[PDB]
Swiss-Prot record:
Domain of life (superkingdom): Eukaryota
Effect of residue 18 to A: Reduces DNA-binding by 70%
Function field: Transcription factor required for successful completion of meiosis and spore formation. Gets activated after completion of meiotic recombination at the end of prophase I. Recognizes and binds to the middle sporulation element (MSE) 5'-C[AG]CAAA[AT]-3' in the promoter region of stage-specific genes that are required for progression through meiosis and sporulation. Competes for binding to MSE with the transcriptional repressor SUM1, which represses middle sporulation-specific genes during mitosis and early sporulation.
Mutagenesis / variant outcome for changing residue 139 to A: Reduces DNA-binding by 96% and abolishes sporulation
UniProt DNA-binding region: 1-290
Upregulation: Induced during prophase I of meiosis. Requires protein kinase IME2 for initial expression and continued transcription during meiotic divisions. Can autoactivate its own synthesis.
Subcellular location: Nucleus
Name of the featured protein: Meiosis-specific transcription factor NDT80
Residues annotated as site: Interaction with DNA: 26, 79, 139, 170, 216, 281
Phenotypic consequence of residue 170 to A: Reduces DNA-binding by 50% and abolishes sporulation
Effect of residue 164 to A: No effect on DNA-binding but strongly reduces progress through meiosis and sporulation
Description of how the protein assembles with itself and partners: Binds to DNA as a monomer.
Mutagenesis or variant effect for residue 25 to A: Reduces DNA-binding by 65%
Gene designation per UniProt: NDT80
Amino acid sequence: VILTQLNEDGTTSNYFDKRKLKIAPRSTLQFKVGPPFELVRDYCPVVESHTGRTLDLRIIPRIDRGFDHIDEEWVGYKRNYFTLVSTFETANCDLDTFLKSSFDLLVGRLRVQYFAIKIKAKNDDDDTEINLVQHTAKRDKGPQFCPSVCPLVPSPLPKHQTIREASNVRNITKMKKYDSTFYLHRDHVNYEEYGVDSLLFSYPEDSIQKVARYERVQFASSISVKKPSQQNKHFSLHVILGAVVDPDGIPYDELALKNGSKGMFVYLQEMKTPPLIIRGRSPSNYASSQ
DNA sequence: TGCGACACAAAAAC
DNA sequence: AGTTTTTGTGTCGC
């Protein structure tokens, strides 16, 4: 009834079928590592402004809630939350040096203002985009919002246990404990060590995330989870790393900038999950029906 | 047909 | 140790 896999950090992922077993909402058994991501492709090259060195990049993503590995399929539930976290790494650049440097996109052409992640959901069979929604912990008693683009600096991805522990922290002392894991506070650095053109100082806000954490995420309530043949639709979650550049023939989205202008989120790399099955609200998807 | 809205309840958080 | 918070899901109805 429960299949157990050991995670990288020594925690377990316990996969079970909610059609057969009902577990409490806050049980640690609800936390588990989801399907592994794979490279879709690399897009625009990035180089350091003076040396011309190509910046090697790698997205480091993981799902920590919402998906079970059941009989060779990865299964989620329309009504339930998933958690998707990601960082990125720069193999050839240590963080301290990276933040003092400046980078251009090779279309030295366009100056990178900052790096950022976005997530998307798609129908894996035809590439149609599917809307995602997020809630706050207050759920129906708070606002609903779409996942946003997250400015980020390179960092190792926290272990599954750390994401679990930081999922519902309110206590100030505890939050202080995790602060350095999740944020870089630009306002606390020695400004004299940085040039005006440094990458750190073109980030849009002083509080800069080290990890993109998308919690309390759901597929849009109106998604159809079966095909007309009654077969299950296959979905996929995508993570895209981009460089945000000033608007003033390569893949990019438009971004409602901070200068109040129309920025450009230029794609650098994209990863995706294998096909995912999403179970709808039908009573037959729940153990209660048995 | 299935969904928005409200309800219940169980373990985490403090 | 007791109270509040969070979230899977049961249920009513439009």
